Design an enzyme around this catalytic site. Structure first.
Site, mmCIF file in Angstrom:
data_model
loop_
_atom_site.group_PDB
_atom_site.id
_atom_site.type_symbol
_atom_site.label_atom_id
_atom_site.label_comp_id
_atom_site.label_asym_id
_atom_site.label_seq_id
_atom_site.Cartn_x
_atom_site.Cartn_y
_atom_site.Cartn_z
ATOM 1 N N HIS A 1 11.363 29.222 5.596
ATOM 2 C CA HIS A 1 11.580 29.366 7.093
ATOM 3 C C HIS A 1 10.983 30.368 7.696
ATOM 4 O O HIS A 1 11.110 30.879 8.945
ATOM 5 C CB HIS A 1 12.992 29.845 7.044
ATOM 6 C CG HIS A 1 13.658 30.730 6.085
ATOM 7 N ND1 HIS A 1 13.438 32.180 6.296
ATOM 8 C CD2 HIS A 1 14.196 30.771 5.051
ATOM 9 C CE1 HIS A 1 13.926 32.933 5.394
ATOM 10 N NE2 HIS A 1 14.507 32.097 4.400
ATOM 11 N N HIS B 1 20.333 26.991 4.512
ATOM 12 C CA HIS B 1 19.979 28.124 3.662
ATOM 13 C C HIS B 1 19.986 29.324 4.342
ATOM 14 O O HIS B 1 20.045 30.407 3.791
ATOM 15 C CB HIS B 1 18.897 27.774 2.859
ATOM 16 C CG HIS B 1 18.574 28.884 1.873
ATOM 17 N ND1 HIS B 1 19.190 29.379 1.099
ATOM 18 C CD2 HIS B 1 17.231 29.661 1.742
ATOM 19 C CE1 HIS B 1 18.910 30.062 0.128
ATOM 20 N NE2 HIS B 1 17.513 30.510 0.633
ATOM 21 N N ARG C 1 14.544 36.923 -5.852
ATOM 22 C CA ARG C 1 14.025 35.997 -6.357
ATOM 23 C C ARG C 1 12.562 36.399 -6.818
ATOM 24 O O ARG C 1 12.065 36.973 -6.015
ATOM 25 C CB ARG C 1 13.998 34.873 -5.510
ATOM 26 C CG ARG C 1 13.173 33.775 -6.028
ATOM 27 C CD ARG C 1 13.247 32.384 -5.208
ATOM 28 N NE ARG C 1 14.574 31.780 -5.277
ATOM 29 C CZ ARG C 1 15.058 31.299 -6.342
ATOM 30 N NH1 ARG C 1 14.421 31.193 -7.647
ATOM 31 N NH2 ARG C 1 16.137 30.664 -6.442
ATOM 32 N N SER D 1 19.366 24.438 -7.737
ATOM 33 C CA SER D 1 18.076 23.702 -7.788
ATOM 34 C C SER D 1 17.757 23.471 -9.301
ATOM 35 O O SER D 1 18.256 22.675 -10.070
ATOM 36 C CB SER D 1 16.860 24.062 -6.876
ATOM 37 O OG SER D 1 15.731 23.282 -6.846
ATOM 38 N N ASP E 1 27.713 29.075 -4.103
ATOM 39 C CA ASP E 1 26.341 29.050 -3.394
ATOM 40 C C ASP E 1 26.044 27.932 -2.658
ATOM 41 O O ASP E 1 26.663 27.077 -2.599
ATOM 42 C CB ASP E 1 25.285 29.364 -4.534
ATOM 43 C CG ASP E 1 23.860 30.239 -3.976
ATOM 44 O OD1 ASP E 1 24.070 30.673 -2.800
ATOM 45 O OD2 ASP E 1 23.031 30.434 -4.927
ATOM 46 N N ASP F 1 0.933 -1.102 0.001
ATOM 47 C CA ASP F 1 -0.125 0.136 -0.021
ATOM 48 C C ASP F 1 0.684 1.136 0.135
ATOM 49 O O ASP F 1 0.284 2.349 0.088
ATOM 50 C CB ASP F 1 -1.033 -0.030 1.201
ATOM 51 C CG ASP F 1 -0.098 -0.126 2.326
ATOM 52 O OD1 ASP F 1 1.166 -0.213 2.570
ATOM 53 O OD2 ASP F 1 -0.670 -0.138 3.584
ATOM 54 N N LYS G 1 20.653 40.026 -5.087
ATOM 55 C CA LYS G 1 19.931 39.040 -5.753
ATOM 56 C C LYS G 1 18.424 39.291 -5.414
ATOM 57 O O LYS G 1 18.216 39.423 -4.086
ATOM 58 C CB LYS G 1 20.350 37.465 -5.667
ATOM 59 C CG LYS G 1 19.236 36.708 -6.335
ATOM 60 C CD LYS G 1 19.554 35.032 -5.894
ATOM 61 C CE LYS G 1 18.322 34.131 -5.641
ATOM 62 N NZ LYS G 1 18.949 32.928 -4.683
ATOM 63 N N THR H 1 19.667 30.773 -10.369
ATOM 64 C CA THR H 1 20.427 31.615 -9.954
ATOM 65 C C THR H 1 22.090 31.648 -10.316
ATOM 66 O O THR H 1 22.594 32.580 -10.593
ATOM 67 C CB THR H 1 20.780 31.301 -8.271
ATOM 68 O OG1 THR H 1 19.328 31.591 -7.582
ATOM 69 C CG2 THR H 1 21.696 32.263 -7.308
ATOM 70 N N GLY I 1 18.943 25.805 -11.227
ATOM 71 C CA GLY I 1 19.994 26.527 -11.676
ATOM 72 C C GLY I 1 19.767 28.067 -12.110
ATOM 73 O O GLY I 1 20.687 28.606 -12.594
HETATM 74 N N1 ADP Z 1 0.637 -1.178 5.686
HETATM 75 C C1 ADP Z 1 1.130 -2.405 5.976
HETATM 76 N N2 ADP Z 1 0.847 -3.543 5.178
HETATM 77 C C2 ADP Z 1 1.055 -4.917 5.235
HETATM 78 N N3 ADP Z 1 1.765 -5.331 6.611
HETATM 79 C C3 ADP Z 1 2.032 -4.351 7.183
HETATM 80 C C4 ADP Z 1 1.628 -2.967 7.209
HETATM 81 N N4 ADP Z 1 1.944 -2.339 8.233
HETATM 82 C C5 ADP Z 1 2.599 -3.263 9.184
HETATM 83 N N5 ADP Z 1 2.664 -4.514 8.696
HETATM 84 C C6 ADP Z 1 2.984 -5.787 9.178
HETATM 85 O O1 ADP Z 1 2.048 -6.599 9.407
HETATM 86 C C7 ADP Z 1 2.149 -7.806 10.260
HETATM 87 C C8 ADP Z 1 1.412 -7.955 11.229
HETATM 88 O O2 ADP Z 1 0.089 -8.560 10.531
HETATM 89 P P1 ADP Z 1 -0.904 -9.299 11.255
HETATM 90 O O3 ADP Z 1 -1.619 -8.438 12.537
HETATM 91 O O4 ADP Z 1 -0.192 -10.518 11.744
HETATM 92 O O5 ADP Z 1 -2.053 -9.694 10.152
HETATM 93 P P2 ADP Z 1 -3.164 -8.553 9.720
HETATM 94 O O6 ADP Z 1 -2.672 -7.181 10.178
HETATM 95 O O7 ADP Z 1 -2.907 -8.612 8.083
HETATM 96 O O8 ADP Z 1 -4.466 -9.251 10.087
HETATM 97 C C9 ADP Z 1 3.550 -7.179 10.976
HETATM 98 O O9 ADP Z 1 4.571 -7.831 10.282
HETATM 99 C C10 ADP Z 1 3.715 -5.782 10.375
HETATM 100 O O10 ADP Z 1 5.175 -5.409 9.884
HETATM 101 N N1 ADP Z 2 12.151 24.315 -1.996
HETATM 102 C C1 ADP Z 2 11.859 25.682 -2.435
HETATM 103 N N2 ADP Z 2 12.039 26.250 -3.758
HETATM 104 C C2 ADP Z 2 11.918 27.161 -4.464
HETATM 105 N N3 ADP Z 2 11.384 28.164 -3.716
HETATM 106 C C3 ADP Z 2 10.812 27.914 -2.374
HETATM 107 C C4 ADP Z 2 11.341 26.682 -1.750
HETATM 108 N N4 ADP Z 2 10.855 26.746 -0.640
HETATM 109 C C5 ADP Z 2 10.329 28.141 -0.134
HETATM 110 N N5 ADP Z 2 10.656 28.716 -1.461
HETATM 111 C C6 ADP Z 2 10.180 30.100 -1.671
HETATM 112 O O1 ADP Z 2 11.024 31.128 -1.771
HETATM 113 C C7 ADP Z 2 10.651 32.442 -1.663
HETATM 114 C C8 ADP Z 2 11.647 33.060 -0.801
HETATM 115 O O2 ADP Z 2 12.878 33.229 -1.341
HETATM 116 P P1 ADP Z 2 13.745 34.491 -1.317
HETATM 117 O O3 ADP Z 2 14.251 34.437 0.154
HETATM 118 O O4 ADP Z 2 13.084 35.558 -1.832
HETATM 119 O O5 ADP Z 2 15.133 33.983 -2.233
HETATM 120 P P2 ADP Z 2 16.267 33.089 -1.930
HETATM 121 O O6 ADP Z 2 16.045 31.846 -2.982
HETATM 122 O O7 ADP Z 2 17.604 33.597 -2.078
HETATM 123 O O8 ADP Z 2 16.092 32.589 -0.350
HETATM 124 C C9 ADP Z 2 9.463 32.217 -0.870
HETATM 125 O O9 ADP Z 2 8.222 32.613 -1.816
HETATM 126 C C10 ADP Z 2 9.304 30.845 -0.492
HETATM 127 O O10 ADP Z 2 8.040 30.527 -0.579
HETATM 128 MG MG MG Z 3 15.374 33.169 1.758
#
Ligand code: ADP
Ligand code: ADP
Ligand code: MG
Ligand code: MG
Lengths: 287, 285
Positions: A95, A126, A188, A216, A212, A36, A186, A220, A218
């Protein structure tokens, strides 16, 4: 002083280098997806009584789940301490709120990580504001010396920051290389677009190293590279700590730059500069 | 009140909002180029009781929930209430082996740190409710399943395992029917072993009810053994229909019809639990 270095999926390369330097064996979880799509992991290694160092980035959904589930799994052992080292810290760009109703993503995620650890560390976060979202000591390590070492015998005239936030980094790196530096203003515009104002520095016939924190899209590096090339730069090296390289970033950059060299915080074909020494120094100070 | 509809629950949330006489709120949502999630709530949530509706099982679902829990902090709300119709990680509610996570524990601790209440429908194992710092309610689809089958010709209600016995005992009683349960041993993620009791189902019409259908391994195996025993018709129902690849085929090979609830939206969601969720919300406000 017993230590265990846990290597999450994002960080096998850097984690291995760290473990080797420290004369220990990396610990990897047995890990799989249930049908799943839920995440399963298990630590068969007995972590009892050891200082644990979890090495993994925190930017992709899967990276986050692997970290969170790891933080539960290790509670099965009476560890000496639990220390998160996220070489690239995700959500560091969100941030604060920039519009009403936005998440402060780095805040909630840092609060979660700090609730389950005794310390957190990252390399070249950053924005330092995020360090102050943590209840435990959140250390900001720096790749500066590794970058200096890579370029020690490379001819460079100026080290250049593409923004004002990077001024300190480039002042330090240029100092250590015995070179000059300057920074670009700079602004953005959106996820892929920036505007810049380059100071009136004569770079005609000059060799430049642009540094820098993140690459990401590129956008900048591409903009700074292009404007500097316009100004007559003869060679442009590009370095960044965290090389994500999405959306045709490599091409945009190399349209105006000559070479790209990033660290191993994020593993790519450009990861030529290891930050293992810096991380080991931190680990030794804690362990 | 404000009803927030996360991406996994648009249909059930809409039905809920309709019944409660309010318009659902959806965040503006996108992925940054590096794959990080962005969201934003433009509706002023100030002074309202907030009900966030979203499942918590996929990586993205969890991220959407966590980021929403941060985003709504921008508003001075009256309360924050999580309703995860299908509660993710409920199957990992204990450590089966050394060094495993109790996934449902840490996630529940996280959610309950940023909300005033949590609810779900038919959690896989109730132990997880105790992991919560706040009131965590377990709602039930029993009466809705009974309403669906009340005029259907059924001879037995059947649980594929011991865990689903309480549910089928309740449903059968309400339908005026007999019931029994099969004993199940899970072998791996996709394989189970079962012992059907010595019950005469030859030419009998059966309703199999379970909490979750994931791979359909559990329903397929039970359906197949019951078909071998001469069952004439088999209806399959479950609260949470995930139906991962292949499940539909595996089940329909031995069963005649599938009807699940809308906790997880799919083409088999013929039974809605909106009433049960609305009843719960009204107790909260
Ligand atoms: N999302 C998941 N899908 C399938 N198995 C999982 C998931 N999360 C945990 N398990 C595992 O299922 C096992 C427990 O299953 P169990 O309770 O014996 O049978 P069931 O839950 O199918 O009736 C554990 O080994 C656990 O690691
Ligand atoms: N992973 C990310 N990639 C790109 N932009 C992001 C990411 N996380 C946040 N931002 C956005 O970047 C902007 C802030 O960037 P800013 O401080 O102006 O420039 P710098 O890129 O130099 O930090 C905000 O709008 C913020 O939501
Ligand atoms: Mg920033
Ligand atoms: Mg189980």
């Amino acid at each position: 002083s017993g230590m265990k270095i846990i290597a999450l999926r994002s960080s096998l390369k850097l984690a291995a280098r760290i473990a080797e330097e420290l004369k220990t064996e990396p610990v990897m979880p047995d890990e799989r997806r249930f049908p799943d799509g839920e995440l399963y992991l298990r630590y068969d290694e007995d972590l009892t009584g050891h200082n644990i160092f979890i090495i993994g980035n925190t930017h992709s959904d899967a990276e986050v789940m692997e970290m969170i589930l790891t933080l539960s799994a290790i509670q099965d052992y009476r560890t000496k301490s639990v220390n998160i080292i996220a070489p690239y810290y995700g959500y560091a760009r969100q941030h604060q709120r920039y519009k009403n109703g936005e998440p402060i993503s780095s805040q909630i995620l840092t609060e979660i990580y700090s609730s389950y650890s005794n310390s957190i560390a990252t390399v070249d976060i950053h924005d330092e504001k995020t360090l102050s979202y943590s209840k435990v000591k959140f250390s900001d390590l720096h790749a500066n010396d590794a970058i200096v070492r890579y370029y020690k015998n490379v001819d460079v005239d100026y080290v250049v920051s593409p923004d004002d936030g990077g001024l300190a980094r480039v002042a330090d790196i240029s100092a250590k290389l015995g070179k000059k530096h300057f920074f670009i203003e700079k602004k953005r515009i959106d996820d892929r677009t920036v505007e810049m104002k380059v100071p009136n520095v004569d770079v005609n016939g000059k060799k430049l190293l642009i540094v820098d924190d993140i690459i990401s899209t590129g956008g900048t590096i591409a903009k700074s590279s292009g404007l500097l090339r316009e100004k007559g730069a003869s060679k442009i090296y590009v370095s960044a700590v965290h090389g994500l390289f999405v959306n045709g970033s490599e091409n945009k950059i190399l349209q105006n730059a000559d070479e790209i060299h990033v660290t191993d915080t994020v593993e790519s074909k450009f990861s030529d500069i290891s930050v293992y020494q810096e991380v080991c120094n931190y680990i030794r100070d804690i362990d």
